[PDB]
């Protein structure tokens, strides 16, 4: 354990401008023989780990010109001249000098782009979940930017709590966008009970509040 | 070139054990080693173990020192990992990794230490209307509810449909089960001729269901 710092935490940058990581251990990764052993992992959401850079400054087989590294001692960084959309992860320097080999704890590189407001779409149960006895209504918030969304339901305009979940995808590789959905789950009596089913979305991008609906009847 | 496919996602009840191979091809398998590093959920990455399936010889990290066993059968190119005495904290996603300094990986195996039942789901359509059609696109999806445990895998039309799909993370609801959706965005003209399956795949219950997703008068 010769521990691995890594620095920043977390770092967004807009597409083009350059980005810097540190990663500072505790001794020497410099081998007795002419050689330090120190890499950089570049980790997707979801995916498995692809080397980027070993032995401190060797790249690796097909892998970008804006990728550099260097440092040394105990102070390695890595560096990126010209940050781009498909740079998002979480990337980490790994130690293989020493006794048992140890990461950094990573560093999240989001890219900071321009204000898009969300597109916004709702779909009603399917009749075969209803037979099932519960009724799904989902919310879906696609390609915005930024991440911060406020989404509201409303049945027949009664605001509604406690009864829907959410979830925000990574980042997108391409136009840097995220996407959202919110989830209305309850009883099909309860479904049946009511007539106007509204989600209302809040978003930096959007000047005034919008709000998707439908009649459960005509539907 | 370099493979790395490992076995797929389990469930395994407490105090038990579990076997995880990783086959290899593409290069010398007996005279490389082969890393096994785990990945505790949202919080950084730890080496567990080396072997050289040459010799037979391995390393392990004080931790798993006597949790882990590492064996290797060059007559199939296979590493693989056993782990004792499981416990709820030992649930993860373990990798295999070529070369001393992890040049190559695998994609990964989630192993779920827990005494739940193991659960497919239920696919359900979130079928396409005027309500989810935005200017001139079309936006569809599968609600994939109630299996347990992770991961679920989804495809549209076989894998030939991936462009502007969106497989959002599951949450956990109350009872203990996990939920999740896949939309996609399409044109709207399209849906009176184009056919549109999702393909979910729940590897720890050998489940695999595809459901046909097909416009709805709203």
């Known amino acids: 354990d010769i521990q691995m710092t890594q620095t920043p935490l977390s770092l967004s940058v807009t597409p083009g401008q350059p980005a810097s990581i540190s990663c500072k251990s505790s001794?020497?990764?410099?081998?007795?023989?002419?050689?330090?052993?120190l890499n950089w992992l570049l980790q997707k959401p979801g995916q498995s780990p692809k080397r980027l850079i070993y032995?401190?400054?060797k790249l690796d087989s097909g892998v970008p010109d804006r990728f550099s590294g260097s440092g040394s001692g105990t102070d390695f960084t890595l560096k990126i001249s010209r940050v781009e959309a498909e740079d998002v992860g979480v990337y980490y320097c790994?130690?293989?000098?020493?006794?048992?080999?140890?990461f950094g704890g990573g560093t999240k590189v989001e890219i900071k782009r321009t204000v898009a407001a969300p597109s916004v779409f709702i779909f009603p149960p399917s009749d075969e979940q209803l037979k099932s006895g519960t009724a799904s209504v989902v919310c879906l918030l696609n390609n915005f930017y930024p991440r911060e969304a406020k989404v509201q339901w409303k049945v027949d305009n009664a605001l509604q709590s406690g009864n829907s979940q959410e979830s925000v995808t990574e980042q997108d590789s391409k136009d840097s966008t995220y996407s959202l959905s919110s989830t209305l789950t309850l009883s099909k009596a309860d479904y049946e009970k009511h007539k106007v089913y509204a989600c209302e979305v809040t978003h930096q991008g959007l000047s005034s509040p919008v709000t998707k609906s439908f009649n459960r009847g005509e539907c | 070139q370099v493979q790395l496919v490992q076995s797929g996602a389990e469930v395994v009840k407490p105090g038990a054990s579990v076997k995880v191979s990783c086959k290899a091809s593409?290069?010398?398998?007996?005279?490389?080693?082969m890393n096994w590093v785990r990945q505790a959920p949202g919080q950084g990455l730890e080496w567990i173990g080396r072997?050289?399936?040459?010799?037979?010889?391995?390393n392990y990290a004080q931790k798993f020192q006597g949790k882990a066993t590492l064996t290797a059968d060059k007559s199939t190119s296979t590493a693989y990992m056993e782990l004792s005495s499981l416990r709820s904290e030992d649930t993860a996603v373990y990798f295999c990794?070529?070369?001393?300094?992890?040049?190559?990986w695998g994609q990964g195996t989630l192993v779920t230490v827990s005494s739940a039942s193991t659960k497919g789901p239920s696919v359900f359509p979130l079928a396409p209307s005027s309500k989810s059609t935005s200017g001139g696109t079309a936006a569809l999806g599968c609600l994939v509810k109630d299996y347990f445990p992770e991961p679920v895998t989804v495809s549209w039309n076989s894998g030939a449909l991936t462009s502007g799909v969106h497989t959002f993370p599951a949450v956990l609801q109350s009872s203990g089960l996990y939920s999740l959706s896949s939309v996609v965005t399409v044109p709207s003209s399209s849906l009176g001729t184009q056919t549109y399956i999702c393909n979910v795949n729940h590897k720890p219950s050998n489940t695999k269901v595809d459901k046909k997703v097909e416009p709805k008068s709203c």
């Open positions: 072997i050289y399936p040459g010799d037979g010889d391995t």
């Open positions: 790994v130690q293989g000098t020493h006794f048992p080999q140890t």
């Open positions: 593409g290069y010398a398998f007996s005279s490389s080693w």
């Open positions: 032995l401190v400054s």
């Open positions: 001794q020497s990764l410099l081998y007795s023989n002419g050689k330090t052993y």
């Open positions: 990794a070529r070369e001393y300094d992890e040049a190559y």
